[PDB]
Design a protein around this ligand. Sequence first.
Ligand code: B49
Ligand code: CL
Length: 302
Amino acid sequence: EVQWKVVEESNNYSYIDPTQLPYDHKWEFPRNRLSFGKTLGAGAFGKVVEATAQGAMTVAVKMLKPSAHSTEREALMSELKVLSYLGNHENIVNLLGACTHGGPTLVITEYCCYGDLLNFLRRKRDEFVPYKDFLTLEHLLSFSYQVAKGMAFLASKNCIHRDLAARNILLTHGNITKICDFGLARDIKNDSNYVDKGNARLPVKWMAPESIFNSVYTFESDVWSYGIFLWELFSLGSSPYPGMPVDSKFYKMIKEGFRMSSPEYAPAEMYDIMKTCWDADPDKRPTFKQIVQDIEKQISES
Ligand SMILES: CCN(CC)CCNC(=O)c1c(C)[nH]c(/C=C2\C(=O)Nc3ccc(F)cc32)c1C
Ligand SMILES: [Cl-]
């Protein structure tokens, strides 16, 4: 299941069972104060809908479809539990409330009015200018910085995203980016950026080699995916390894050290970050804390 995980020291780390996390009923919000509007996204067993919450503000509500298995209802509760455990950060999509009694489970989160960053980059591409409502290099550096800060936050809570990519970054007012976990509000069997692997469907072009070939997911594999995200960002939304099918040839190239070339709009210091994120040795990749400091220096030099 493609979703984030909280880990605990064991093994090195093992996933926690999120059903065992506590749920504080302080999050409880009266269901009668929600007015539901348009659907923003929909998986096979769930969906996220724009809503108005009186006591008015626009929010996003995650909920199950009526055909949901009993393990899906628990899964949505576990989503709520993980969000409550993580706490609040500017660069994640934050929990605002929940409805857990008197009806089906509703998870109320922040609404990001511009949608996912990938599609935003793609429709802004032909107006982009490196320097001077155009998208500029200043914005891209800001987005890189914010996603690094959000990931540093998740890592500090022992959380591994496992699917970091521009499609999972949302954009809201003030050019603020927020990391998201679609969970039951997305069906990946649709999306060609996921690839069949055994029983699983996986975002192979974003994954570290040790995740693909050894099923190892760590703080360090998230850094690999962040490097792929940077490439998406400074390519203005191009698909990674463009024109290369995922087959045995692709896997061999990754294993033997093949990497993407620099996007034409990436500053050399940002391509330097990408390259270190894609070190075959996870111990040689930077931490998100290091990445934050490096990008802070570039913005200062800007
Ligand atoms: C296909 C691109 N289209 C624009 C050109 C669609 C635009 N994209 C949109 O409208 C959109 C908006 C405005 N919000 C979301 C998603 C979420 C949001 O806001 N909070 C969440 C919390 C959890 C979650 F799992 C998803 C969301 C979308 C897809
Ligand atoms: Cl910021």
